[PDB]
Amino acid sequence: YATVSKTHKTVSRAYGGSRCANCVKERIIRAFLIEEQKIV
Amino acid sequence: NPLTHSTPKNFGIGQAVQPKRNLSRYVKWPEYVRVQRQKKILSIRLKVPPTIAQFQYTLDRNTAAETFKLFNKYRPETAAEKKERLTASPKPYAVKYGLNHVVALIENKKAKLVLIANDVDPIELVVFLPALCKKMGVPYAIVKGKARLGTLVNQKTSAVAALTEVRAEDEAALAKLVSTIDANFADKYDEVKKHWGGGILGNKAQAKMDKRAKN
Amino acid sequence: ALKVRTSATFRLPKTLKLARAPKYASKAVPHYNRLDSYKVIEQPITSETAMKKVEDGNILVFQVSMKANKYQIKKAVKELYEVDVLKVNTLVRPNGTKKAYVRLTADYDALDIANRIGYI
Amino acid sequence: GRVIRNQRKGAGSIFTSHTRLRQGAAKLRTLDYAERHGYIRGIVKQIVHDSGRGAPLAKVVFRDPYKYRLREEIFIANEGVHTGQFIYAGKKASLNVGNVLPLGSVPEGTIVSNVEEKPGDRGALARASGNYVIIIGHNPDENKTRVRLPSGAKKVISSDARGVIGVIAGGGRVDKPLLKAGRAFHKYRLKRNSWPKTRGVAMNPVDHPHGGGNHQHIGKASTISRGAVSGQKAGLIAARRTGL
RNA sequence: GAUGGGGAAGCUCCGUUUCAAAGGCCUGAUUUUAUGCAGGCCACCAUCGAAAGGGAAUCCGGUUAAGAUUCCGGAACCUGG
RNA sequence: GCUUGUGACGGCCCGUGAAAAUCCACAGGAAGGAAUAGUUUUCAUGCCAGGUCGUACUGAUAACCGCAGCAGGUCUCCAAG
RNA sequence: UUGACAUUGUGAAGUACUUAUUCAAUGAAGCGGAGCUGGACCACGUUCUAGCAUUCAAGGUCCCAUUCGGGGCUGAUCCGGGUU
Numbered sequence A: 001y002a003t004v005s006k007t008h009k010t011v012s013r014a015y016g017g018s019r020c021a022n023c024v025k026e027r028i029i030r031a032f033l034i035e036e037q038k039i040v
Numbered sequence B: 001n002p003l004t005h006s007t008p009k010n011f012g013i014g015q016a017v018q019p020k021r022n023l024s025r026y027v028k029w030p031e032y033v034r035v036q037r038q039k040k041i042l043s044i045r046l047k048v049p050p051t052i053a054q055f056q057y058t059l060d061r062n063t064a065a066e067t068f069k070l071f072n073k074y075r076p077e078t079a080a081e082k083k084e085r086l087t088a089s090p091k092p093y094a095v096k097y098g099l100n101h102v103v104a105l106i107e108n109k110k111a112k113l114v115l116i117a118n119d120v121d122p123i124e125l126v127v128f129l130p131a132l133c134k135k136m137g138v139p140y141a142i143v144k145g146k147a148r149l150g151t152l153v154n155q156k157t158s159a160v161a162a163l164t165e166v167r168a169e170d171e172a173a174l175a176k177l178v179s180t181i182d183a184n185f186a187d188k189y190d191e192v193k194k195h196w197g198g199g200i201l202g203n204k205a206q207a208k209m210d211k212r213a214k215n
Numbered sequence C: 001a002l003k004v005r006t007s008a009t010f011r012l013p014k015t016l017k018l019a020r021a022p023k024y025a026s027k028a029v030p031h032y033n034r035l036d037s038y039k040v041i042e043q044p045i046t047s048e049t050a051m052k053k054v055e056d057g058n059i060l061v062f063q064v065s066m067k068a069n070k071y072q073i074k075k076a077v078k079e080l081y082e083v084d085v086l087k088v089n090t091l092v093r094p095n096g097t098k099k100a101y102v103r104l105t106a107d108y109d110a111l112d113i114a115n116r117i118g119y120i
Numbered sequence D: 001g002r003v004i005r006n007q008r009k010g011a012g013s014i015f016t017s018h019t020r021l022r023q024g025a026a027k028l029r030t031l032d033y034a035e036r037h038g039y040i041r042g043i044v045k046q047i048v049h050d051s052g053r054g055a056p057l058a059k060v061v062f063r064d065p066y067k068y069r070l071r072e073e074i075f076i077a078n079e080g081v082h083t084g085q086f087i088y089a090g091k092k093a094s095l096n097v098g099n100v101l102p103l104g105s106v107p108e109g110t111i112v113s114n115v116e117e118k119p120g121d122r123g124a125l126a127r128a129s130g131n132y133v134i135i136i137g138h139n140p141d142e143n144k145t146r147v148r149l150p151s152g153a154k155k156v157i158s159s160d161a162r163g164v165i166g167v168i169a170g171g172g173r174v175d176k177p178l179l180k181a182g183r184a185f186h187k188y189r190l191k192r193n194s195w196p197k198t199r200g201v202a203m204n205p206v207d208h209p210h211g212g213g214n215h216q217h218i219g220k221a222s223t224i225s226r227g228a229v230s231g232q233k234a235g236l237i238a239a240r241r242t243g244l
Numbered sequence E: 001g002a003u004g005g006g007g008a009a010g011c012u013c014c015g016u017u018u019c020a021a022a023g024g025c026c027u028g029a030u031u032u033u034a035u036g037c038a039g040g041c042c043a044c045c046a047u048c049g050a051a052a053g054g055g056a057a058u059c060c061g062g063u064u065a066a067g068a069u070u071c072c073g074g075a076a077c078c079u080g081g
Numbered sequence F: 001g002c003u004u005g006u007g008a009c010g011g012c013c014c015g016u017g018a019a020a021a022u023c024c025a026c027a028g029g030a031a032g033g034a035a036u037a038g039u040u041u042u043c044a045u046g047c048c049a050g051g052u053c054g055u056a057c058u059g060a061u062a063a064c065c066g067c068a069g070c071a072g073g074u075c076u077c078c079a080a081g
Numbered sequence G: 001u002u003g004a005c006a007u008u009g010u011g012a013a014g015u016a017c018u019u020a021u022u023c024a025a026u027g028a029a030g031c032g033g034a035g036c037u038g039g040a041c042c043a044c045g046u047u048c049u050a051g052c053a054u055u056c057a058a059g060g061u062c063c064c065a066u067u068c069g070g071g072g073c074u075g076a077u078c079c080g081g082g083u084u
């Protein structure tokens, strides 16, 4: 992995080469809803 | 004002990471530090025999300064002025020091005032002096600091200091100090001999005992 | 007041360290170069197989000291024989000596070097 | 005679525990400020098998109060605990399965497991699968708590000792017969070298106190006193009674 | 299997992070010379242990009496700078 | 079809079937930065260097061990009709 | 294994204390006492959710001598240095 370019090792999104798209989607939905519940 | 905002942090249990606080009470000190601190505590927790307990009383700051003021006027000759004298001389007046030297002076009733250090680690060296001075009628004062006594004799430590002869212009000052010093040490030696020191409790044990007595 | 200690762990303090200033020399006479060019290159090897590599392969064969590496062999040949070296291959012979295959650059001919050294 | 089998085990050469595949020592958190005053929330990451242990283990992640990182704790999982569940540990934790509470902050008849004998030893009692501790009394003036142990014994423990609400998972394991020597072999392959066992009466007198004779028999009473020495304690040690 | 420590008349025994003040890489500060001095970071604390476990990177053709994925020709690749 | 590699699955356990070096990504946003000028050596091309030790041969009814050129013993890969 | 003596001290009456000794834990983090605030002697920032939490902390206020920033107090109550 040290010889290849970075474009082969990541995806143009948050948590690109760490978490898949569905898990990133769950993180965002959970973050928004929980913080809204905190205010109320 | 329109850009800066106030965001106080919550430092309760389960909240944000705790800030940096002073933890000097909880420092794991080196072994030698703990031993010298625990040695101080242990000698206070136990009952102290009167012969040792008499050394907890020291001359207070006021007349101790007057005492050292008189003794500083009889400094022993230094090596620098030793050469000048050697290269026909008036009779010298100086402070006598040295444990063996001073003890012999006391036994011959030649010492007029004896200063005793209160922090001699081999305490046996100096523990018998108050009784010896009392027996021989030589006034004595337990003073604070073996390093301070050494300063006026050009030594690191001295552990004892004595005046045997004084100039005629300082006899009045010496006589006044003897009266004050006698009232603090020589006159009260009889009852201090019957008092046991120590027995002090720790901070937490003291509060626990007070709480138990209260309720 | 006292120092504020944010950590409960006590560490050994950093103290000044002085460099050595000896009052007499350790040996007072430095040793000369233990591996000079004459000690690296011991003697050429003139076996018939070695001679074939000279004329054909443009390669000089030498017996070298057991303590010399390829850097020292290349340096020794350049100053002893005023030639450029392409690469050096070495091996330890079954009799306990080291043999080096030294190949010169294209600008030099090994045969002309060999007869100048004295062996043909 | 020679050194008998049970004496040789103390040297610990070939009789040590086989711990290559162990997940780690199963312990509670270290008793800290958050535990003794409030509560701290942890998250169950996974429930995994541990070699040589019948009961499953739970991996619970807590946040470090004093610096920014995560801390990993290995617990013995109780029945009902699942991945993604929040675990609350402390003096003010709720009375729910999987929560860790002091024994003095729970009502009478509570079922607990992984109970501390002393505050801060991180769990000593009721660790095997299907076992639990019943709390049967409180002594607030003496700060003590009376409990019942899986063996049936009654013990008095400090009220500051911690425990986990619920029963250790994996119960009912010993009700299934092993049914053959092969499964016994694999059971102890990951515990220690204590299987198979040779009967003493099948040995020679040099090997065992039960050895020898023209018939296979013990020859003297197998009840051995507590005061006997090593090499003699083979059989029923300090037996109060025998028989069915 | 050293060290710190504790045993043992002693040869030596225990123990491997242990009741220890246990160690060094990013750079700032200096243009007297090379590293004194300033915040912070990190506390993991010897070492040995696999030519079948883990692991950066090479291939084909030709060549000798006996050498080659090691030499020759051609064509590649990795690491450090 | 044979040998071998591999993929998606299924059966089995009171057995659920190593560790570490090492490499990469992300979160974070300390600093560093342009207009007559700077930055990227995770894009392309170009330059230099890569030490030390092993390397022949037998591997067995004759090169190993059994007193020996002993019908014994001694781990493994390739496998045509 | 049992008794005696030594280690071995301190206070009361017909068990109590602490300092020796012993056990255990923590890269010795929040102990003891008091004082605020609340409630009725107790509490005094966290419980629908597999998210997130780090740069002497933002803010408030007091200094430097304005430049790119630095220094106190407060935020985060005092007291005793007995790690628990």
Ligand SMILES: [Cl-]
Pocket (backbone or CB within 6 Å): D004, D005, D207
């Ligand atoms: Cl046996």
Ligand SMILES: [Mg+2]
Pocket (backbone or CB within 6 Å): C090, C091
């Ligand atoms: Mg070689």
Ligand SMILES: [Mg+2]
Pocket (backbone or CB within 6 Å): D202, D203, D204
């Ligand atoms: Mg038999």
Ligand SMILES: [Mg+2]
Pocket (backbone or CB within 6 Å): D001, D205, D206, D208, D209
């Ligand atoms: Mg027998």
Ligand SMILES: [Mg+2]
Pocket (backbone or CB within 6 Å): D209, D220
């Ligand atoms: Mg018998």
Ligand SMILES: [Mg+2]
Pocket (backbone or CB within 6 Å): none
């Ligand atoms: Mg050893």
Ligand SMILES: [Mg+2]
Pocket (backbone or CB within 6 Å): none
């Ligand atoms: Mg090694």
Ligand SMILES: [Mg+2]
Pocket (backbone or CB within 6 Å): none
């Ligand atoms: Mg060959």
Ligand SMILES: [Mg+2]
Pocket (backbone or CB within 6 Å): none
């Ligand atoms: Mg070969």
Ligand SMILES: [Mg+2]
Pocket (backbone or CB within 6 Å): none
């Ligand atoms: Mg042989």
Ligand SMILES: [Mg+2]
Pocket (backbone or CB within 6 Å): none
């Ligand atoms: Mg032989």
